[PDB]
Design a protein around this ligand. Structure first.
Ligand SMILES: Nc1ncnc2c1ncn2[C@@H]1O[C@H](CSCC[C@H](N)C(=O)O)[C@@H](O)[C@H]1O
Length: 202
């Protein structure tokens, strides 16, 4: 029902964020999911180092998490697939001051595709809010995390565990990475997992 609203408004990092929404004509990438609100709240509370830190957001959708992380001092590469790009670029540009904008990159990253255009030790922080849902690209997503996550890098995945497939991806993630519960929101039923490369000796 919140999805039907043409505009979703939030207060994060001493700023009013006005997200344009389009559930009807664009769908999933054009609405703010609860996991993006929960992850953005967690980033604000202080357990994560953000100031001057290199960050990438995967499947940003509207871009809330990436916007909040940028406003909190990170150098964020806010990404999604080609079809979501235009709408993502519009919410980012209209919600960031120009001094934050120069430290922000809005570009495409389709999971497991053109991974070579990204440096394996480029990002210290990897973000994803409610991006676990499409079984057909689970391998694509794991190959992206494995390509981007250096030994120092931390992954923060905010999830709504809906079906068996969700636990399956988390088991796939656990094979190569340490996966630890760092936050749980009962009313929104969202868990934030932190992931790190397990065998750092390679
Ligand atoms: N193969 C793929 N490559 C990149 N992004 C993908 C993808 N498959 C799905 N996504 C993206 O994953 C997102 C799930 S919607 C979640 C949007 C946002 N983080 C929020 O929580 O509000 C969508 O934006 C969708 O475009």
């Amino acid at each position: 029902q919140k999805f039907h609203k043409p505009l979703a408004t939030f207060s994060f990092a001493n700023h009013t964020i006005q997200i344009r929404q389009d559930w009807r004509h664009l769908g999933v990438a054009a609405v703010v999911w609860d996991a993006a609100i929960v992850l953005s709240t967690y980033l604000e509370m202080g357990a994560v180092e953000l100031r001057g830190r290199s960050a990438v957001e995967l499947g940003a959708g509207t871009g809330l998490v990436g916007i909040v992380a940028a406003l909190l001092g990170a150098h964020v590469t806010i990404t999604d697939r080609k079809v979501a790009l235009e709408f993502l670029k519009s919410n980012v540009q209209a919600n960031l001051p120009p001094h934050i904008q120069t430290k922000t990159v809005v570009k495409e990253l389709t999971w497991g595709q053109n991974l070579g255009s990204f440096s394996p030790g480029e990002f210290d922080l990897i973000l994803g809010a409610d991006i676990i849902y499409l079984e057909e690209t689970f391998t694509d997503l794991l190959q992206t995390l494995e390509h981007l996550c250096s030994n120092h890098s931390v992954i923060l995945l905010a999830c709504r565990i809906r079906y068996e497939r969700d636990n399956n991806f988390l088991a796939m993630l656990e094979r190569q990475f340490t996966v630890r519960k760092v936050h749980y929101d009962p009313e929104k039923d969202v868990h934030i997992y932190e992931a790190q490369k397990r065998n750092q000796k390679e």
